C-alpha cells in the first residue's frame, strides 16, 4: 500500500531544468561549430586570418602561403 506519490521537484529557472538543458548541450556544440566555421569562412580573406590561423593548418595550410613575385609587385 502506497500512502503518497513519490516525487521531487528538480531545480529550475525561467522554465528550464537541468535534464532538459542537458539534452541540448550537444546542439549548442554543433551550432558553435557552425558559427566557428561560418565566422572563419567570412574572414578567410583577411590577411591576418591567413597568417595566424589558416596557414598553420597541417598539409592544407600551404594553400594560404602565397607570395607575389617581387618583380610583379608595385608596392
Amino acid at each position: 500500500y502506497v500512502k503518497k506519490p513519490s516525487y521531487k521537484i528538480v531545480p529550475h529557472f525561467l522554465g528550464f531544468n537541468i535534464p532538459t538543458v542537458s539534452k541540448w548541450i550537444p546542439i549548442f556544440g554543433i551550432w558553435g561549430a557552425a558559427a566557428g566555421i561560418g565566422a572563419l569562412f567570412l574572414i578567410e580573406g583577411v590577411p591576418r586570418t591567413r597568417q595566424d590561423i589558416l596557414s598553420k593548418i597541417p598539409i592544407i595550410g600551404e594553400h594560404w602561403i602565397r607570395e607575389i613575385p617581387a618583380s610583379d609587385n608595385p608596392f
Binding site: 528538480v10 531544468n17 535534464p19 532538459t20 542537458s22 539534452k23 541540448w24 546542439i27
Partner: protein, 438 residues
C-alpha cells in the same frame, strides 16, 4: 492480481480463451475474427460490413423473427462490429444463459441463410447509412485519414464500401467471403465474467466443430503498406467546429516500438474543455491549449494494424482564427519528443500508462474485448506483469530515438473538416515537423 487467462484449442484450430471472474453475475461470450474490410479486394469492398447486417437476418433453422425472440428470451443482448482488421460478434448474458448464447453465435456465423430477398432489403438500409455517417464527424475524419494515408491500398478502403458495390453484392460473394475468411484458425471464442473455461470448451466442441479450416494455417495476428503523406480538406464553413486529424505512419502491434509509441502518445495526451480536471493536466500541449482557448478537445491516438499503424492527434476547435496556432503548437510539442524529452516526462507518462492499460478493463465486455484483441493481434494474452515490464523498459532515450525516426521531419497525413480556412497548406503544416533551432 488478475485471474489467469486460460487458453485451449480445438481440432479444427479454433482458439478458446477465457477469463473467469466469480465476483460478477453476467458473462460476455463472443467470437473475435482476425478478418475485416482489409480482406476484401476492390470489387467486393463492403462485403464484411454487409455480412454483419445479414448475420442477424436469420439462419437455416431460426427465421429472422425466431432469432429475435430467442435472444429476447435469453435476457441479454448481441452486438457486432466490423473494423479494418477485426470483426467481433458478442453476446452479453446471464451466467447460466451462456449455452444459449454460444449456440446462437455459432448458428449465425456458420448457418446464415443470406436469402436474396434479405440481401435486397439490406441493400437499401446500408445505402442510407452512407448518408448518415456524414454526421459522425470523428468517424468521417478518421475514414478520410485512412483513405489518404494508405492511398489505393487495402487499409485505405472504407468499411462501408462504395455505393456501386452495395448495389452489386450477391449472396454468392458474401458466402465466398465468409468461407475464405471466417475460418477456425482465424477465430477466437472468448468468454469473460461468469464462465467456466471447461464448460466453454465443451460448448465449442458441440457447436463450432464443423467450422472450415483454412488451407494454410498461419499463426494469429499474421499480416504491403506504403504511407502517403497527403492531405484532405473538407471545408464546410457552415459547421461551427473544425475537426482536424494529423497522423504519421505509426507502429504495428508486434513492433518493438509499440510501447515506446504509446508512451510518446501519453506525453501529449488528451484534453477536453468540458472535463473539469483537464485544465490542470501536466501535458505541455494541454497547458498551451487551455490557457489560450485554442481547442475544444484533442485526443492523441496510436492505432495499430498487423503491419503498420497511424500515430497522431485529433483536434476539435471553434477558434477558427487560431487554428494555425493550435496546429503550430501541436506540432512543436511533437518536435519536443525528438529534441527535449527527458526522464521527467517519460517517467510521468509511464506511470499514467501502467494504470491506464489496466484501468480500461472495468467490465466483462472490456475484458473480453481485451482478450479478443490481444489473441487476434499477438497470438497470446499478455499478462499485466509482462506489460508492466515492457513499460518499465521504455527509457527517455528510447522515446527520443523513436520520435526521431518516426516523427521528426516526416510526412504527415492531414485531414481537416469544417471551417478550416485558417489551416495552412500542406507545406506549412509539414514544415512544423522539424525545428530549425535544433
Amino acid at each position: 492480481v488478475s485471474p489467469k487467462t486460460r487458453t485451449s484449442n480445438l481440432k479444427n484450430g479454433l482458439t478458446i480463451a477465457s477469463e473467469s471472474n466469480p465476483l460478477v453475475q453476467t458473462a460476455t461470450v463472443g467470437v473475435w475474427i482476425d478478418a475485416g474490410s482489409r480482406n476484401e479486394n476492390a470489387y467486393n469492398n463492403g462485403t464484411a460490413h454487409f455480412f454483419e447486417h445479414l448475420a442477424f437476418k436469420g439462419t437455416d433453422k431460426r427465421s429472422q423473427h425466431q432469432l429475435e425472440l430467442d435472444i429476447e428470451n435469453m435476457g441479454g443482448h448481441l452486438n457486432a462490429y466490423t473494423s479494418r482488421e477485426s470483426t467481433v460478434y458478442y453476446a452479453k448474458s446471464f451466467k447460466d444463459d451462456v449455452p444459449k448464447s454460444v449456440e446462437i453465435l455459432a448458428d449465425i456465423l456458420q448457418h446464415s441463410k443470406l436469402a436474396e430477398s434479405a440481401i435486397d432489403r439490406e441493400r437499401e438500409v446500408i445505402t442510407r447509412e452512407l448518408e448518415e455517417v456524414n454526421k459522425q464527424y470523428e468517424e468521417v475524419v478518421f475514414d478520410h485519414l485512412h483513405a489518404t494515408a494508405f492511398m489505393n491500398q487495402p487499409l485505405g478502403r472504407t468499411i462501408l464500401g462504395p455505393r456501386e458495390n452495395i448495389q452489386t453484392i450477391t449472396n454468392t460473394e458474401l458466402r465466398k467471403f465468409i468461407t475464405e475468411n471466417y475460418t477456425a484458425d482465424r477465430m477466437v471464442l472468448v468468454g469473460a465474467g461468469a464462465v467456466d473455461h471447461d464448460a466453454l470448451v465443451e460448448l465449442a466442441e458441440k457447436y463450432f466443430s464443423h467450422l472450415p479450416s483454412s488451407q494454410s494455417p498461419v499463426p494469429l495476428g499474421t499480416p504491403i503498406p506504403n504511407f502517403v503523406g497527403s492531405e484532405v480538406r473538407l471545408r464546410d464553413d457552415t459547421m461551427p467546429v473544425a475537426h482536424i486529424a494529423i497522423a504519421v505512419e505509426g507502429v504495428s502491434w508486434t513492433s518493438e516500438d509499440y510501447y515506446t509509441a504509446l508512451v510518446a502518445q501519453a506525453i501529449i495526451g488528451n484534453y477536453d474543455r468540458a472535463v473539469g480536471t483537464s485544465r490542470h493536466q501536466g501535458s505541455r500541449l494541454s497547458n498551451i491549449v487551455s490557457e489560450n482557448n485554442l481547442a475544444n478537445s484533442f485526443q492523441s491516438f496510436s492505432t495499430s494494424y498487423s503491419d503498420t499503424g497511424l500515430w497522431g492527434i485529433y483536434l476539435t476547435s471553434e477558434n477558427t482564427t487560431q487554428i494555425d496556432d493550435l496546429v503550430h503548437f501541436t506540432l512543436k510539442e511533437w518536435n519536443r519528443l525528438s529534441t527535449s524529452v527527458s526522464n521527467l516526462q517519460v517517467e510521468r507518462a509511464k506511470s499514467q500508462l501502467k494504470a491506464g492499460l489496466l484501468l480500461s478493463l472495468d467490465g466483462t465486455t472490456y475484458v473480453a474485448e481485451d482478450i479478443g484483441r490481444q489473441l487476434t493481434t499477438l497470438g497470446r494474452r499478455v499478462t499485466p506483469a509482462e506489460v508492466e515490464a515492457k513499460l518499465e523498459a521504455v527509457t527517455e532515450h528510447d522515446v527520443r530515438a523513436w520520435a526521431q525516426k518516426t516523427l521528426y521531419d516526416k510526412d504527415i497525413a492531414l485531414v481537416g473538416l469544417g471551417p478550416i480556412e485558417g489551416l495552412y497548406d500542406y507545406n506549412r503544416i509539414r514544415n512544423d515537423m522539424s525545428m530549425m533551432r535544433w
